[PDB]
């Protein structure tokens, strides 16, 4: 937390708004669980003993300010780092704090949505008993064309005794991991609004899971509208901000 | 400033705005951000400046306000000038609706013979020096 006497040649703050997409899709193709779990993570480098305020586009805040008719974020299960004054949040919606030095996490929130999953996965599966098995999987990116997921990993279970793997895919790379009884399809760069295909068969129950990161993106529409800084000295200080979406817990059931 | 003169294309759109069906669009998820570009709330200076460009080139004055029309303006400014589209809110009726954004020189006045109530954008420079919304409703401010 804060101490006195801090000093920098340059005063700045960075905010990382990070959203983690939770997913459970039942085997059938119907969605059990869709959830966003976010946090705001801050690197602070501020001399002296400043005073911070965080404007978000916060449904309530807008509702109370005659700005209700605007697009906002109605954001649940909000919990704050310690230094945040609640007496102010309780009444105003105001996020008011004296920030620690450097890295620390300012707040967390949750959202519920039924909205197209960012990455959709169908795997069809043809098994010939005691003989061979076949996997036809299709990955589809359902987020905006002009964004791009990174380091996407699709993890699909194959049977603990399968052998002799073979696969083809137009995009990415597939590998066998016997120790986890899974195959792993890795696409390094995954543009939005696209369908990719990978084929796999072997020879002769946990969910399909995916991992992805999307920079310059959020699924919640959360804007950090401004960050106010007051310190007694005439202070030149700049806030910086980015948004990052990532998977957290994201799974398609299989059976 | 010349891309500020992609306004006719916006103004154009702003205007003209056993059964038939809406073609539901296929929605793409998420809210992208363009990489280093600063997004900020609307400013007194910009709101004043925008205001005036608009009263000159025309099309806003006495056009009839629907939220649909409003929104096309806001997105335009959001995409070209990078101001979050929360600023063009007005004070509630009935009556004349006042800008909540000090510096925005348009208000919503009702009107009868030409036809809840119907309104039009109307320009008022007094809105620039007199924050009517704030005194009508300091509850919204600080």
């Amino acid at each position: 937390w804060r101490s006195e006497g801090i000093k920098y040649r340059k005063n700045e703050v960075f905010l990382d708004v990070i959203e983690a997409v939770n997913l459970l899709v039942s085997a059938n193709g119907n969605v059990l669980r869709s959830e966003i779990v976010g946090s705001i993570k801050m690197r602070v480098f501020l001399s002296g003993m400043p005073e911070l305020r965080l404007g978000l586009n916060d449904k309530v805040l807008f509702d109370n300010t005659g700005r209700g008719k605007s697009k906002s974020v109605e954001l649940e299960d909000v919990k704050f780092h310690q230094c945040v004054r609640l007496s102010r949040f309780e009444n105003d919606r105001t996020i008011s704090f004296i920030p620690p030095d450097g890295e620390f996490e300012l707040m967390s929130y949750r959202l519920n949505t039924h909205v197209k999953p960012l990455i959709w996965i169908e795997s069809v599966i043809e098994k010939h008993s005691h003989s061979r098995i076949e996997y036809m999987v299709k990955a589809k990116s359902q987020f905006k064309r002009r964004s791009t997921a990174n380091n996407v990993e699709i993890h699909i279970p194959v049977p603990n005794d399968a052998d002799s793997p073979k696969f083809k895919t137009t995009v990415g790379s597939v590998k066998w991991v016997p120790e986890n009884s899974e195959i792993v399809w890795s696409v390094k760069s995954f543009p939005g609004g696209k369908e990719y295909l990978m084929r796999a068969h072997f020879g002769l129950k946990p969910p399909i899971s995916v991992k992805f990161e999307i920079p310059y993106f959020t699924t919640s529409g959360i804007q950090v509208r401004y960050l106010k800084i007051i310190e007694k000295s005439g202070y030149q200080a700049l806030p910086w901000v980015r948004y990052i979406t990532q998977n957290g817990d994201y799974q398609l059931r299989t059976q | 400033k010349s891309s500020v003169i992609g306004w006719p294309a916006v103004r154009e759109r702003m205007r003209r705005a056993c059964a038939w069906l809406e073609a539901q669009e296929e929605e793409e998820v998420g809210f992208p951000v363009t990489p280093q570009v600063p997004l900020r709330p609307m400013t007194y200076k910009a709101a004043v400046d925008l205001s005036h460009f608009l009263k000159e080139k025309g099309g806003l004055e006495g056009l009839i306000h629907s939220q649909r029309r409003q929104d096309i303006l806001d997105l335009w400014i959001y995409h070209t000038q990078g101001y979050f589209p929360d600023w063009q809110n007005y004070t509630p009726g009935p009556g004349v609706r006042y800008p909540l954004t000090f510096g925005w020189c348009y208000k919503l006045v009702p009107v009868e013979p030409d036809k809840r109530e119907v309104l039009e954008w109307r320009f008022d420079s007094r809105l620039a020096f007199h924050h009517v919304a704030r005194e009508l409703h300091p509850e919204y401010f600080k």
Binding site: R242, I244 | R134
Partner: peptide
Amino acid sequence: DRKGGSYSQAAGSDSAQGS
């Protein structure tokens, strides 16, 4: 080109409403 992407500068007040 960095990390989880590049930062954009942010505003210091709600110029929309007072300041």
